[PDB]
């Protein structure tokens, strides 16, 4: 491929995307605030997205040329991610105004920096279209700065990373896979590298009994674990995985009057989502509890829903306390269990499912990609052997191998392709079929529909 | 700006590039290991080459989104380093061959990597044009990852980064900025957030005494400096800052028959650079000297040179012992200094130098840029200038970023700084009111320039 080829097949992509905006007299994507956060949900729209993000990352990388390449990651990469701590912890999405801008001086003065290093930070972010400097001396948001003001989630996503994932565990997996190789022990792991035998450290149990700190109204134990909660929450509101997505990929009004039992549920957030758009339909959130879980539960919890959804402590691994409910329904709950473990819960659901009217649901990653909503006969030319996103340069690859990577750095998870997760669920029990694996397009998970036929 | 603003600013870039491969008859940059590994040097070319990184990464980012940018990059971000992590550590680019494909089993079996954990590392690093797999089952190289092959120079890039900087001194910055502000101090950096005073250590000296470990043919004692030491040598073989681009920078075939010192020269590379295409020039590389230095200086040292570049064992804040030279010159050396120790540095060579015959040399980031060099005019067809920046420069420049990683790559190990023009003037003026800037060239795709001074 070269850079003529990769700048023609921009064109087209963009040419897409432009003529459904005008079309619909839709806003147009810019660097300022008030810019829509996203492009429509049409899927045609979106698959000219993921096609021209993939080719404009191409004719950048192109461009730069392998002698640069290399020499300029290892430069600059690490330091996009400082840049967002800096940001993060010297709270500066929000001491900048959203629509007015600020001097560094003072702005220095609201957030603790000093000038001269503010500069040089804020410097780094207008690289990134993290910010800019519209006259000399002065600081603005743009869009993608903007979106973290007031939002305690973007910061929880920025820290997790930056102060937990990185350092103790990504920073770590190559020590850790010539110590234990190619293993799934969540025990086997950056943090245990020089433990003791029996003083190995897991990760969830970091999360919950860390008492040193706070965050987001939690204080003292289980702060870091209440902070990975927001993180899971900040991918429900907005982007990729968004929960309203989950309302396009199952039939969840043609339920009627049902039960949904959501094992390993977190905060019941997701639940929240489904059955506020969803009057008919009651949600019974099973999570491990903790000294603060109720109380957060219920301060989130919108009273809207008139009790519709509530919480029962469970171990997902033990057995189900709920019979015969309509669906039993896990989302990104299997990707941090190891067939032997998975076959475990499923085996749990399995037990508890009335076989003639019960459906287990989950939403994972499908590495090699679900199927369109039915809502959405290729007209113009499809590319390669892959669907738009999807292939070793796709970025919706790209996005599962970033979270492939984040199971496999903190517990040694793993996502699984189709015909893994069929070969699964038929283990942990013959009847098992798979009736549906839609996938949004966009999106980077799938929410499969199983029952026992 | 929007999507279709940038489709079109990229259209016109490619059309400058392409059409000079064309005319030119030069090969296309590809993907595949047997691409160019850059595009000419000609000015016209790398500017419309350093505007289309820009937009093209402003393109990206914009088709994102801003509800997806901040989620996709902590999630992605990070593990671009540790992919090259694994790449490095396992030594894949030399374990699978250049031009042909290999089977995961089988480079499972040459690395020791279990083939499953192989095949996600592989995937992650196609994604970034670092490797392909051309069929089933199968893994080959791209130009990316096929430059890396048989170079430990780019090994000792990624492991220094990610193995060194980053866990002890960049993910470390904010908690050393709460303890000690803003401050200027090389002991204020991470490894010393508990260190009791007096027992800081500093990362030059981690660097020269740790002895738990080996490094491409040195063992023990330094092999960190030594691995650092690879690290300068990997930017002066290739790239933006590649030695070669001295050449043009500056006239060292006018010195005639001179002597050229070089202060803080690391191993003499660059010296060589020079040397080797100047046969009148000699070089005195002064550098501090290490236990497997004077071994290694002469094992690499090309013998074509026939004894012009030499070793002399030197502290730069001491006084200069090589009177009268034609040249002093110190390439990245003075943007680690806070401005007292510069000044220390240059009052230094001030006194050995003869301000009728010798000149100061220096090569280091201008931040607002320096000037084309005089050929440029000469090889160039009418231009016009549009927007404040020249390519490469302004606040999403892609040469403003290589030079913002640079300073904050000297931030996080010793607090260091690059400057402006203006400041370099300043900061000249103030060791020496009679130094005058004479020359400030930075070739055009270059984030550094070659600075030179006179004592008027
Ligand atoms: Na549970």
Redesign the interface.
């Given at each position: 491929?070269?850079?003529?080829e990769l700048?023609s097949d921009?064109?087209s992509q963009?040419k897409v995307?432009?003529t459904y905006l005008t079309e619909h007299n839709l806003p147009?994507?810019?660097?300022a605030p008030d810019?829509?956060?996203?492009?429509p949900l049409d899927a045609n729209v979106q698959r000219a997205?993921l096609l021209?993000?993939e080719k404009?990352?191409?004719?950048?990388?192109?461009?730069?040329?392998?002698?640069?390449?290399?020499?300029?990651?290892?430069?600059?990469?690490?330091?996009?991610?400082?840049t967002?701590?800096?940001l993060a912890?010297?709270n500066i999405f929000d001491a900048v105004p959203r629509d007015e801008p600020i001097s560094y001086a003072e702005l220095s003065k609201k957030v603790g920096?000093?000038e001269?290093?503010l500069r040089?930070i804020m410097?780094?972010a207008?690289?990134?279209?993290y910010f800019?400097?519209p006259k000399p001396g002065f600081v603005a948001h743009?869009?993608?700065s903007?979106?973290?003001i007031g939002d305690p989630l973007?910061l929880a996503?920025?820290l997790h990373?930056?102060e937990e994932?990185?350092?103790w565990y990504?920073?770590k997996?190559?020590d850790a896979?010539?110590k234990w190789?190619?293993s799934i022990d969540p025990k086997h792991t950056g943090p245990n590298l020089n433990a003791k035998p029996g003083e190995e450290k897991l990760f969830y149990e970091i999360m919950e009994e860390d008492d040193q700190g706070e965050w987001n109204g939690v204080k003292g134990k289980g702060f870091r674990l209440w902070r990975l909660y927001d993180t899971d929450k900040?991918?429900g509101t907005?982007?990729?995985i968004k929960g309203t997505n989950l309302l396009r990929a199952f039939d969840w009004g043609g339920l009627g009057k049902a039960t949904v039992v959501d094992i390993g549920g977190i905060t019941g957030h997701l639940a929240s989502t489904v059955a506020l758009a969803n009057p008919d339909l009651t949600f019974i959130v099973q999570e491990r509890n903790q000294p603060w879980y109720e109380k957060q539960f219920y301060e989130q919890l919108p009273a809207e829903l008139n009790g519709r959804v509530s919480y029962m402590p469970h171990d997902k691994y033990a057995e189900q306390p709920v019979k015969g409910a309509d669906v039993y329904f896990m989302s990104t709950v299997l990707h941090k269990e190891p067939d032997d473990k998975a076959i475990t819960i499923l085996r749990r659901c399995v037990e508890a499912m009335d076989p003639n009217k019960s459906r287990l649901l989950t939403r994972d990653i499908v590495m090699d990609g679900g199927d369109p909503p039915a809502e959405d006969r290729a007209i113009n030319s499809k590319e390669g052997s892959y669907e738009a996103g999807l292939g070793?340069?796709?970025?919706i690859?790209?996005?599962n191998?970033?979270?492939?990577?984040?199971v496999?750095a903190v517990v040694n998870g793993?996502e699984r392709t189709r015909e893994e997760w069929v070969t699964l669920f038929k283990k942990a029990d013959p009847r098992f079929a798979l009736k549906g694996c839609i996938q949004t397009v966009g999106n980077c998970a799938a929410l499969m529909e199983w029952i026992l036929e």
């Open positions: 491929v070269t850079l003529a700048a921009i064109q963009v995307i432009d147009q994507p810019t660097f810019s829509p956060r996203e492009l997205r021209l993000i404009a990352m191409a004719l950048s990388n192109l461009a730069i040329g392998a002698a640069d390449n290399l020499r300029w990651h290892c430069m600059n990469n690490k330091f996009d991610d400082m967002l701590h800096f912890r010297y920096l000093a001269h290093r040089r410097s780094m207008y690289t990134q279209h800019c400097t743009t869009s993608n903007a979106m973290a973007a996503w920025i990373n930056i994932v990185q350092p990504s920073n997996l190559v896979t010539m190789g190619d900040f991918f907005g982007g990729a070793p340069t796709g970025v690859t790209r996005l191998i970033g979270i492939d990577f984040q496999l793993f």
